[PDB]
Design an enzyme around this catalytic site. Sequence first.
Site, PDB file in Angstrom:
ATOM      1  N   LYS B 103       0.826  -1.202   0.000  1.00 29.33           N
ATOM      2  CA  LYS B 103       0.000   0.000   0.000  1.00 29.33           C
ATOM      3  C   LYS B 103       0.864   1.256   0.000  1.00 29.33           C
ATOM      4  CE  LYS B 103      -3.635   2.146   2.610  1.00 29.33           C
ATOM      5  NZ  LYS B 103      -2.626   2.964   3.337  1.00 29.33           N
ATOM      6  N   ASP B 208     -10.842   4.985  14.650  1.00 27.43           N
ATOM      7  CA  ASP B 208     -11.782   4.021  14.092  1.00 27.43           C
ATOM      8  C   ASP B 208     -11.059   2.955  13.275  1.00 27.43           C
ATOM      9  OD1 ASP B 208     -14.219   2.883  12.667  1.00 27.43           O
ATOM     10  OD2 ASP B 208     -13.336   3.898  10.995  1.00 27.43           O
TER      11      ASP B 208
END
Lengths: 250, 243
Positions: B103, B208
Amino acid sequence: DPLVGVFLWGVAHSINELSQVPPPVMLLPDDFKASSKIKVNNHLFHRENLPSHFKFKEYCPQVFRNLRDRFGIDDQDYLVSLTRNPPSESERFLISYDRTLVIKEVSSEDIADMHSNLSNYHQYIVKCHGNTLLPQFLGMYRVSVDNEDSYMLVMRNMFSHRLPVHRKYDLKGTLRDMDFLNKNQKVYIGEEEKKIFLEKLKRDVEFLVQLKIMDYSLLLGIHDIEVYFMGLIDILHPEQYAKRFLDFIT
Amino acid sequence: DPLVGVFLWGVAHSINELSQVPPPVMLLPDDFKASSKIKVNNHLFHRENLPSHFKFKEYCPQVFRNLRDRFGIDDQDYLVSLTRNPPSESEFLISYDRTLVIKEVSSEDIADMHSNLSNYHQYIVKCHGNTLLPQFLGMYRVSVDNEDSYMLVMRNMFSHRLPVHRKYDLKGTLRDMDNKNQKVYIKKIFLEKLKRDVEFLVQLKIMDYSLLLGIHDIEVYFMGLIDILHPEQYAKRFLDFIT
């Protein structure tokens, strides 16, 4: 010693990234201006051998490689016979562990003139097919260590890796050619085989001529049982002292 | 492919460079502030594959050296699969083996990571490097053409063989809102990991973070905590929601 350890590191890296590179058939100008430089920056890494910070660069990566080939010298061996092992210090001469090659430290300018004579050099390599008494040049690098520069030259050792020299002078016109008088040097090994030699000797120095190459000497060694090792060494008016040489070694 | 292709040069270089440095006995804190950069520049040399003016930065070699061996991935293994064959991109650049993922992440993305390494690693030692978290196998920055780019390689949470047919994005591309009557039957084990992982993921106050879901029609389901980048509050929504 970093520098010698940096040296090898560089010899390997390049020669293996060079291998991954297809050899051109014809040396273009840009290839004689071509270069290859790596900088290695390590914060809290390695430091087990090579400095945390160093530099490296091979000159004309394709040009000297092409000479290696011309010098019937495979690179894998050139490496293994260079990196597989540490060399020994001599005199900044350095015999390969194989004792097949000679690493000498050189000057910032010496490289340049090398880069200057360079384009001429290979012309001779190809034409005479790399057999002259001249020093076979395969390696020319520069090793910076903590903002410290040092250029080294790698060539084939004129002496044998096996048979040890017991006699060795530097013929001109380790005692120099001034103490070769009273001992009565031996100008005989065989008419035939000597001719070939004498042949090379003349042309090799006709070549030095064309470059205005300053004073040069010839290194002759011996391995008695006697074996001999001889070729010009100090190749870095001329026509006047020149006819002194070929004749002196005659 | 200029940067990507410059990426593998360094990856190999590193993996082939790390191979000579003896692995330590204990990773020191300063290691977490270590780096190893390479500035390569040749004049008129090659062009055919690799740029003439690239650079490479491998972040904290040893740690990731260790976080690799600890995730059961041999540097050679890690190497060959990441470089041997040109990687394919996805919605990253899924390796050619479908084993590894690479990534991209912003320089800020990284800044967190340098915090994340300290605790993340000690954690990983404790749990024996086997959570439902991503496996940070490496972190690099290949700057090509005066343009820095931050890449971070991780294990494909999916399998290079069993292909997904269905993937859920459960928080608290179907997300957690999408009635098709999921399948919760097969458990205390996987719950062993998710319970402590988040426990740790919450320790860093971390906000989150979702859970990835995988499915395979031939029961094959590939899931694990993914978006690891108040703590108690929506935490108890997750484990409970993914329960």
